[PDB]
Symmetry: D2
Subunit: 115 residues, 4 copies
C-alpha cells in the first residue's frame, strides 16, 4: 500500500467514518484525471487506492468530501471539501500516509512519508 488516507473528527474525538474521497493525477494538459476513490472505514482509514506499479511520480490531488460528512452529522461546515495536492517523488522506497483532522471551520493535514 503506497498511499493511505486517514481522517479524524475533532468534534467527536473519533475516526471520521464513511468519508468519501477522490484522488486525481495531473495530466500534461494541466487537467485532473480521476485516479482512485473510496470511503473511509470504521477506523477512518482508506487503503488499497493504488499499487506501487501504478503510483508513478507526478502531482496528485486528494479531494475529501468533508461537506457531506458534516451535513450527515447535522453540522454546518465552512469548506466545500478538503484538498491535498502534492508531488510524489522517487527517493528510495517510500509509502505515503495523508492524514486530515476535521473541524467544521478548520482542518489540518499532514503527510507521513516512510520507507
Amino acid at each position: 500500500c503506497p498511499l493511505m488516507v486517514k481522517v479524524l473528527d475533532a468534534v467527536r474525538g473519533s475516526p471520521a467514518i464513511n468519508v468519501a474521497m477522490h484522488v486525481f493525477r495531473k495530466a500534461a494538459d494541466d487537467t485532473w484525471e480521476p485516479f482512485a476513490s473510496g470511503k473511509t472505514s470504521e477506523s477512518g482509514e482508506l487503503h488499497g487506492l493504488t499499487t506501487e506499479e501504478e503510483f508513478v511520480e507526478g502531482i496528485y490531488k486528494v479531494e475529501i468530501d468533508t461537506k457531506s460528512y458534516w451535513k450527515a452529522l447535522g453540522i454546518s461546515p465552512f469548506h466545500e471539501h478538503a484538498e491535498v495536492v502534492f508531488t510524489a517523488n522517487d527517493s528510495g522506497p517510500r509509502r505515503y500516509t495523508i492524514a486530515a483532522l476535521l473541524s467544521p471551520y478548520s482542518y489540518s493535514t499532514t503527510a507521513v512519508v516512510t520507507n
Copy 2:
C-alpha cells in the same frame, strides 16, 4: 475588507512573508475563473483582494503557493499549495478571514466569519 488571508510559519515562529496566492470563483459553466491575487505583507496578511460589491455569492477557492515559499527557505516541502474552497455570502454578506499555518509536511487552515 470582506476577504483577508493571514499566513504564519510554524518553523520560524513568524508571519509568512511574500507568500503568493490566487483566488478563483466558480463560473456558471463550472470552471474556475480568476478572481483576485496578491502576496502577503511583512505581517503575513493580504488585504484588499476584493470589495463588498464585487464579492457576490459563489464558490471561491484560495490557492496559497506554499511550495515557492518553502523553496526560497531551502526546504523541499510536501504540498504543491494549500487550497481553501468555500461557499461565500450564501446568507447575505459576510467578512471572511482565511488563516493558514505552514510547516514543510503539514498545514492547518481555519476561517473566521463575521457578520
Copy 3:
C-alpha cells in the same frame, strides 16, 4: 505589549470570547508562581497581561481554561485546559503572541515571536 494571547473557536468559526487564562512563572525554588491573568475580549484577544519591565527572562506557563469555555456552549470537551510552556526573553526582550485554536477533542497552539 510583550505578551498577547489570541484564541479561536474551530466549531463556530469565530473568536473564542470570555476564555479565562492564568500565566505563571517558574520561581527559583522550581515552583509555579502566579504572574498574570485575564480573559479574552470579543475579538478573542487578551492584551495587557504584563509590561516590558516586569516580563523578565524566565520559564512561563499560559494555562487556557478551555474546559469552562466548552461547557458554557453545552459541549463536554476532552481537555481540562490548554497549557503553553516556554522560555521567554533568553536572548533579550521579545514580543510574544500565543495563539490557540480550539475544538472539543483537539487544539493547536503556535507562537509568533518578534524582535
Copy 4:
C-alpha cells in the same frame, strides 16, 4: 492498551522517534503524581503505559519532552514541552489515543476515544 500516545514530526513528515514522555495523575492534594513513562518507538508510538485495572477515572497529564527532540535535530524550539491534560471518564468501554503533531514553534494535539 487503554492509553496510547502517537507523535509525528511536521518538519520531516515522519514519526517522531525516541521522544520521552511522562504521565502523571492528579492527587487529592492537587499535586502531580508520576504514573507512567516511556519513549516513542520507530513508529512514533508509545504503548503499554498502563492497564485497564490501573487506569481509573481522574485527571491525567502527559508531558512530552519536545524540547529535547528538537535539540537533538539541531533545531531551536519554542516550547519547553507539550502538555496534554484531560479527564478520563467511564462511559462504556473506552480506549484513548493521544496524538501530537510537532513543529518547532507550534504543536497540535487530538484525542481519539474509541470503544
